[PDB]
Design a protein around this ligand. Structure first.
Ligand code: SF4
Ligand code: SF4
Length: 80
């Protein structure tokens, strides 16, 4: 698992929207879900790159951006 930006990658696995004691992967405006809302991380104001998510969808999507333990230079967690 790598990166977890705001993507409309959701099917109904529940995963990703569970492993997060900080509550990052929240509900966003989408047009595909039963409630036209995709589980993404819009307000990542709270998240110090913890080890929980590591399950952002099957990766079938997840725009090729990479982030999780990738750069951690300016977006480490606070520096951002
Ligand atoms: S690092 Fe932790 S708080 Fe941040 S997205 Fe992953 S599970 Fe949620
Ligand atoms: S891993 Fe991908 S399908 Fe599953 S709950 Fe998260 S967004 Fe939805």
């Amino acid at each position: 698992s790598h990166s977890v930006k705001i993507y409309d990658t959701c099917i109904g696995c529940t995963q990703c929207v569970r492993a997060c004691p900080l509550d990052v992967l929240e509900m966003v405006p989408w047009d595909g879900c039963k409630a036209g809302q995709i589980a993404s991380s819009p307000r990542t104001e709270d998240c110090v790159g913890c080890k929980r998510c590591e399950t952002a969808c099957p990766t079938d999507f997840l725009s090729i951006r990479v982030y999780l333990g990738a750069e951690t230079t300016r977006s480490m967690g606070l520096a951002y």
